[PDB]
Copies of this chain bind each other. A is one copy, B any other.
């Protein structure tokens, strides 16, 4: 009687199953399906993360059931119908039905599926999905992967005056990206695990969400994202203290490079080919007239590219110092930064061969990157 039955647009179900799949990364994972009040609610969870998604469907009968996430994902992606019927048939299973094809998936008791934890938040605020995607995109790549340094295995989400900021570091580089809030929020500082950051970023970037807003609710132990009303993610937070990164930002520089971003990234990538693992270094030999990007690989060879001074936007190179500077970097850390912001030009602020480079993008005043050099 109270068995779930609904008709759903296949493309929409496929999108939801994609998000439900990636958060529990598989054969043991179950997805809860709940048809109520004109919508289907799809829930996925593990020890760290809980995702609830609601999509509009034609609810023929209200009810709930749970099935294998992977099997449901694999099946729906291969049905050709533009709409599917989902019907809980009891001992027969959950029936997924198109025009000519029927799959029965065995169900597991809904009583075995946990409800989303309650949160009683200490801070609550809303920002655009465009702004939130920006700050995660600009910081997720420089998270520490060293699972021992647990306080660095995520992004540091914090308030500074009216700025909502994300910072990340792995010891070799620092990334900072922020957006101005209109409201006066209490100062907080929490560390969002890498996986949660990756998953929420894909959610806000979805075409249905990117032009809308995301509500953020948090306390010391958990954070809740409500993305465009119908998608809710609850994540644990890392118990740790993020370092005071403010002292890591260079306050002065003795030379400045302005260069076409894509030209610089492509040249670094080309020259880095010759290097060997654990010896990943490219040398930037900077002068007013030319930049030489070079590298060596033991028992492989060496490589050099020359970039000439140019005021043409597509090949732009300007280095306004009489002194030459030869400074080395891990090419991956430069490439990560150059890929993170879509900009014609990039600015690099230097001191000596041992001091970090400050990297900025001219039209992007709320993104800052610091990268340490290597000796070359």
Give me the interface of A with B, judged by CB distance under 8 Å: 68, 71, 74-75, 78-80, 93, 100-106, 266-267, 269-271, 273-274, 299-307
A271 to B101, CA, bound (A): 8
Question: A80, A269, A270, A271: which has the most chain B beta carbons within 10 Å?
Answer: A270
The 10 closest A-B pairs by CB, nearest first: A101-B305, A105-B301, A103-B303, A104-B301, A78-B270, A74-B273, A104-B302, A93-B301, A102-B304, A106-B301
In the complex, residue of chain B having the shortest beta-carbon distance to the beta carbon of A271: B101
Copies of this protein chain in the complex: 2
Q: List B contacts of A305 (CB < 8 A).
A: 100-102
- A105 & B75 in contact (Cβ 8 Å cutoff): no
- B68 & A300 in contact (Cβ 8 Å cutoff): yes
- A71 & B106 in contact (Cβ 8 Å cutoff): no
- A75 & B300 in contact (Cβ 8 Å cutoff): no
**Known contacts A75-B274, A269-B78, A270-B79: A300-B106 contact under CB 8 Å:** yes
In the complex, residue of chain B having the shortest beta-carbon distance to the beta carbon of A269: B78
Q: List B contacts of A307 (CB < 8 A).
A: 100
Smallest beta-carbon distance A215→chain B, Å: 38
A301 to B304, CA, bound (A): 60
Smallest beta-carbon distance A76→chain B, Å: 10
- B71 & A104 in contact (Cβ 8 Å cutoff): no
Q: List B contacts of A301 (CB < 8 A).
A: 71, 93, 103-106
Smallest beta-carbon distance A53→chain B, Å: 22
Q: List B contacts of A274 (CB < 8 A).
A: 71, 75, 103
Q: List B contacts of A68 (CB < 8 A).
A: 300
